[PDB]
Amino acid sequence: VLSAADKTNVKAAWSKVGGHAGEYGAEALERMFLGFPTTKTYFPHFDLSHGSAQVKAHGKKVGDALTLAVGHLDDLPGALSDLSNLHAHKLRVDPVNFKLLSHCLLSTLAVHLPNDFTPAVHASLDKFLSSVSTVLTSKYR
Amino acid sequence: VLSAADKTNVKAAWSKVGGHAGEYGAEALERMFLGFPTTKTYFPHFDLSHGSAQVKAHGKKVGDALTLAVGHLDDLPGALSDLSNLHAHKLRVDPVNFKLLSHCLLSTLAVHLPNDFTPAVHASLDKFLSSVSTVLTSKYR
Amino acid sequence: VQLSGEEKAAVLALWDKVNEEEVGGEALGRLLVVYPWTQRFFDSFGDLSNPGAVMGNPKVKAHGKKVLHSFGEGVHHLDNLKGTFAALSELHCDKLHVDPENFRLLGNVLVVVLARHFGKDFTPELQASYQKVVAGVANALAHKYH
Amino acid sequence: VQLSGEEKAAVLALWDKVNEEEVGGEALGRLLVVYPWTQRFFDSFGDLSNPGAVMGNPKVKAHGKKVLHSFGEGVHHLDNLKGTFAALSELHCDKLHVDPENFRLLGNVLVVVLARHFGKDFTPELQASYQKVVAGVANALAHKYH
Ligand code: HEM
Ligand code: HEM
Ligand code: HEM
Ligand code: HEM
């Protein structure tokens, strides 16, 4: 999907995330809910308070999907097909919200991996998150 | 690139554009320059007055590239590779401007083909123009 | 908004010819078909599964007419858009939670529909004025947002 | 902007710790690297071909510092952002022709840089306040636009 250099950067950065993907996913969701309140409307059935068990559990699922994506960079549409249907056809998530979550994920990575979050890695991760977002909204396309 | 139904719609609509692609390309550029003045900064070497010979000539090139794209819907990146380099690497065109030109092209098609510009065809053409725009900005990606 | 006297007269003259029912129904219908995520906000209107269902749905036509009527109020009050849309901004942000990017999308769809109805009379110059109007309305509706 | 008294105090307290040179240089540099089309506006700064060249370029650092200083003026004048940035809005629209979408991009980059410098002290709550600030600055800079 991305350029060779970007894939290298993305796989390397994600290795440093390692087992924290779920925790970072949960924190990114918290940042999104507080920073961009319009996003809360997709989760009426969730307790969105800090330390919510549902947010933690959901962040794990988000983190696991991103880990899956990093392992299938040359075939994102195939690997994320089920999620594309869910987000575009069932949930009808407004595409702007993917940009918001992406920003919150990058913010979260900067907080926790400040020495690894270099300009080059930042750039590659942005491209990666945009590619994932494109796949998840591809039924609108 | 697109769904089968979209490709069908796009090829059909473009057949109705036929030999007017260049004229529509020129008009779309005029609408963009007047409606969105920030775009004029990419064309300092052009006389941007109405009926400008350079705008007419440039619209023909734009129309021809779109016609080429319609003929290569299953391989847009390959068919438009040269243009992707020009727009992203040489000219550094801000991606927002592709959305503006796309809107001006749809406006132009609505003016001239009001009976053919149905909701379904509108939707397919929007997807087509977005796909082309994605390819032309892919070096930023 | 920031329009010359000649531009304002041309904008108002076109509005005299706008059928708010026909144009409004068409604009909202096209929004729902072209940008399908917007269907999420209108689930109470029933079947919106295919273009045919959308374009002929009576609630879409009726709501589209209300939207266009509101646009009309903006056109006739270009010097106080913020005040004209204050209540509607509150509604769209606090109650409906519509992302403001969608106001621009609807405004652009409206312009495409005007182009389709008026043809060559919708000149590049007139479109340019209407782009200022729809941006102005979009900005006024986004006012009470975070 | 629309901030509570407790939020405003927290925003101001963080700014006391912001090195405008370090943060500003980093923010502008990241903008140029991550969103390469923005390089078009800064051709007079010389070589911007690779991350290494960008991040160490003295003009990038100096200009970044000016940008952050201007952000600082906004932070200390949250009740009159439009007035504080009026001249700068004119400059960016009339002279430079920068699309306003890029103001939001720079604001978000700034937030990512604050996160990187402050770590766990840049809490989700504090980030939420800073998102309001950068949106407010972005909107104030877009004021004189068409
Ligand atoms: C990087 C982008 C994203 C990824 C990888 C992602 C991933 C996922 C995954 C893996 C699930 C399945 C959870 C399960 O099976 O229990 C899910 C569900 C869901 N997602 Fe996303 N998501 C993304 C962005 C978004 C955004 C931007 C929104 C809306 C703001 C959103 C809203 C939802 C909702 C409402 C569900 C259903 C949750 C439930 O009912 O339990 N997602 N997402
Ligand atoms: C549908 C999207 C577009 C297509 C298919 C397209 C197509 C083309 C083509 C075929 C050329 C080559 C002209 C030649 O060889 O003489 C060209 C050049 C150029 N394009 Fe685009 N273009 C698109 C959008 C844009 C946008 C949005 C901008 C900026 C607002 C832009 C700015 C330019 C400029 C400045 C040149 C060089 C013109 C010259 O120096 O003569 N294009 N484009
Ligand atoms: C030009 C921009 C728009 C204008 C001028 C506008 C105007 C209006 C008006 C006049 C109403 C009726 C107020 C009432 O209920 O008393 C309304 C309601 C509503 N609007 Fe908008 N609107 C705009 C854009 C949008 C967009 C982009 C969306 C979502 C994609 C949206 C979603 C809704 C919904 C869901 C309602 C309530 C419908 C109901 O009664 O169930 N609006 N709007
Ligand atoms: C937070 C948003 C921004 C703020 C607060 C800001 C602030 C400033 C300030 C204080 C100046 C110096 C004014 C002077 O020349 O006296 C300036 C100049 C400039 N800005 Fe921005 N700016 C912002 C965003 C941007 C963006 C997004 C771009 C383009 C991508 C941009 C492009 C420029 C350029 C090209 C100059 C002139 C540099 C020169 O002297 O050659 N600015 N800005």
Distance, in Å, from the CA atom of B79 to the CA atom of B74, rounded to the nearest integer, reads: 10
Distance, in Å, from the CA atom of B80 to the CA atom of B64, rounded to the nearest integer, reads: 12
Is B98 close to ligand 2, i.e. is its CB under 6 Å away? yes
Write the single-letter amino acid at D138.
A
Q: CA-nearest residue of chain A to C42?
A: A92
Q: CA-nearest residue of chain C to D3?
A: C146
Which tokens sit at D6?
């407790």
Which tokens sit at A135?
């796949």
Alpha helices in B2-141 (DSSP H): 4-17, 21-35, 53-70, 76-79, 81-84, 96-112, 119-136
Q: CA distances (Å), D71 to each of A107, C63, C79, D6, D24, in order? A: 19, 42, 30, 20, 10
Q: Which of A46, A63, A64 is nearest to A54 (CA)?
A: A46
Structure-derived torsion over alpha carbons of residues A48, A51, A57, A59, reported in degrees to the nearest 10: 80
Which tokens sit at D117?
């410098």
Which tokens sit at A129?
């998150």
Number of H helices, E strands in chain A: 7, 0
Distance, in Å, from the CA atom of C144 to the CA atom of C142, rounded to the nearest integer, reads: 6
For the purposes of burial, counting CB atoms within 10 Å of the CB of B7, is it exposed (0-12), middle (13-18) or buried (19 or more)? middle
Backbone dihedral angles phi then psi of residue C90, each to the nearest 5 degrees: -55, -50
Which tokens sit at D85?
């940035």
Distance, in Å, from the CA atom of B92 to the CA atom of B79, rounded to the nearest integer, reads: 20
Which tokens sit at A41?
């409307």
Is B40 close to ligand 2, i.e. is its CB under 6 Å away? no
Q: Helix crossing, D20-34 with D58-75: angle to 10°?
A: 110
Chain A residues lying within 8 Å of B131, measured CB to CB? 141
Number of H helices, E strands in chain C: 8, 0
Is residue A27 within 8 A of residue D123, CB to CB? The reply is no
Q: Which of C47, C31, C34 is nearest to C98 (CA)?
A: C31
Backbone dihedral angles phi then psi of residue C11, each to the nearest 5 degrees: -65, -50
CB atoms closer than 10 angstroms to residue A50? 11
Which tokens sit at B113?
């083909």
Structurally, chain A folds into a number of domains equal to 1
Which tokens sit at C137?
């309305």
Which tokens sit at D66?
């000016």
Distance, in Å, from the CA atom of D5 to the CA atom of C145, rounded to the nearest integer, reads: 19
Is residue C71 within 8 A of residue A66, CB to CB? The reply is no
- Give Rg (Cα) of chain D: 15
| Cβ-Cβ contacts under 8 Å for C49 (sequence gap 6 or more) | none
Distance, in Å, from the CA atom of B15 to the CA atom of B18, rounded to the nearest integer, reads: 5
Backbone dihedral angles phi then psi of residue C130, each to the nearest 5 degrees: -65, -30
**Domains of chain D in sequence order:** 1-146 (1.10.490.10)
Place of tokens 């403001």: C100
- Structural domain boundaries, residue B52: 1-141
Distance, in Å, from the CA atom of B5 to the CA atom of D117, rounded to the nearest integer, reads: 50
| Cβ-Cβ contacts under 8 Å for C98 (sequence gap 6 or more) | A38, C41, C92
C146 and chain D: CB distance < 8 Å anywhere?
yes
Q: CA-nearest residue of chain B to A130?
A: B141
Alpha helices in D19-57 (DSSP H): 20-34, 51-55
CB atoms closer than 10 angstroms to residue B78? 9
| CA B72 to chain CA mean position, Å | 15
Distance, in Å, from the CA atom of C54 to the CA atom of C52, rounded to the nearest integer, reads: 5
Is residue D94 within 8 A of residue D82, CB to CB? The reply is no
| CA A11 to chain CA mean position, Å | 15
Which residues' Cβ are closer than 6 Å to ligand 1? A 39, 42-43, 61-62, 65-66, 83, 86-87, 91, 93, 97-98, 101, 132, 136
Q: Helix crossing, C5-15 with C58-75: angle to 10°?
A: 150
Which tokens sit at B6?
């979209």
Distance, in Å, from the CA atom of C21 to the CA atom of C18, rounded to the nearest integer, reads: 9
Distance, in Å, from the CA atom of C124 to the CA atom of B111, rounded to the nearest integer, reads: 11
C63 is in an annotated binding site: yes
Residue nearest to atom 15 of ligand 3 (CA): C91
Residue nearest to atom 30 of ligand 3 (CA): C38
Distance, in Å, from the CA atom of C70 to the CA atom of C74, rounded to the nearest integer, reads: 7
B141 and chain A: CB distance < 8 Å anywhere?
yes
Q: CA distances (Å), D139 to each of B45, B74, D10, D81, D146, in order? A: 32, 41, 22, 9, 13
Which tokens sit at B27?
């008009």
3-state class (DSSP) for residue C89:
helix
Instruction: Kindly state the DSSP code that residue D122 receives in the 8-state scheme.
Output: S
CA angle (D36, D42, D47) in 5-degree steps: 75
CA of C141 to the centre of ligand 1 (A): 29
CB contacts < 8 A (B, C): 57
Residue among A50, A107, A126 whose CB faces D115 most closely: A107
Chain A residues lying within 8 Å of C36, measured CB to CB? 88, 92, 140
Residues 110-129 of B with CB under 8 A from A: 127
First to last CA, chain C: 23
Is B65 close to ligand 2, i.e. is its CB under 6 Å away? yes
For the purposes of burial, counting CB atoms within 10 Å of the CB of C44, is it exposed (0-12), middle (13-18) or buried (19 or more)? exposed
CATH number at residue A22: 1.10.490.10
Is residue D20 within 8 A of residue D32, CB to CB? The reply is no
Distance, in Å, from the CA atom of C65 to the CA atom of C28, rounded to the nearest integer, reads: 9
| Cβ-Cβ contacts under 8 Å for D79 (sequence gap 6 or more) | none
Q: Which of A47, A13, A17, A9 is nearest to A29 (CA)?
A: A47
Is C50 close to ligand 3, i.e. is its CB under 6 Å away? no
Distance, in Å, from the CA atom of A59 to the CA atom of A110, rounded to the nearest integer, reads: 17
Listed resolution, Å: 1.6
For the purposes of burial, counting CB atoms within 10 Å of the CB of C79, is it exposed (0-12), middle (13-18) or buried (19 or more)? exposed
Neighbour-count burial for A112-138, b at 16+ CB within 10 Å, e otherwise: bbeeebbbbbbbbbbbbbbbbbbbbbb
Which tokens sit at D33?
């690297």
Residue nearest to atom 22 of ligand 2 (CA): B62
Q: Which of A82, A59, A79, A61 is nearest to A70 (CA)?
A: A79
3-state class (DSSP) for residue A10:
helix
Q: Helix crossing, C124-141 with C5-15: angle to 10°?
A: 90
Q: Do C113 and B126 touch (CB under 8 A)?
A: no
CB contacts < 8 A (A, C): 26
Distance, in Å, from the CA atom of D137 to the CA atom of D1, rounded to the nearest integer, reads: 9
Structure-derived torsion over alpha carbons of residues D128, D130, D136, D137, reported in degrees to the nearest 10: -160
Hey, which bits of D73-129 come out as E strands?
A: none
CB atoms closer than 10 angstroms to residue C18? 18
Place of tokens 């575009």: A88
Chain D residues lying within 8 Å of B94, measured CB to CB? 37, 40, 99, 101-102
Which tokens sit at C107?
């405004």
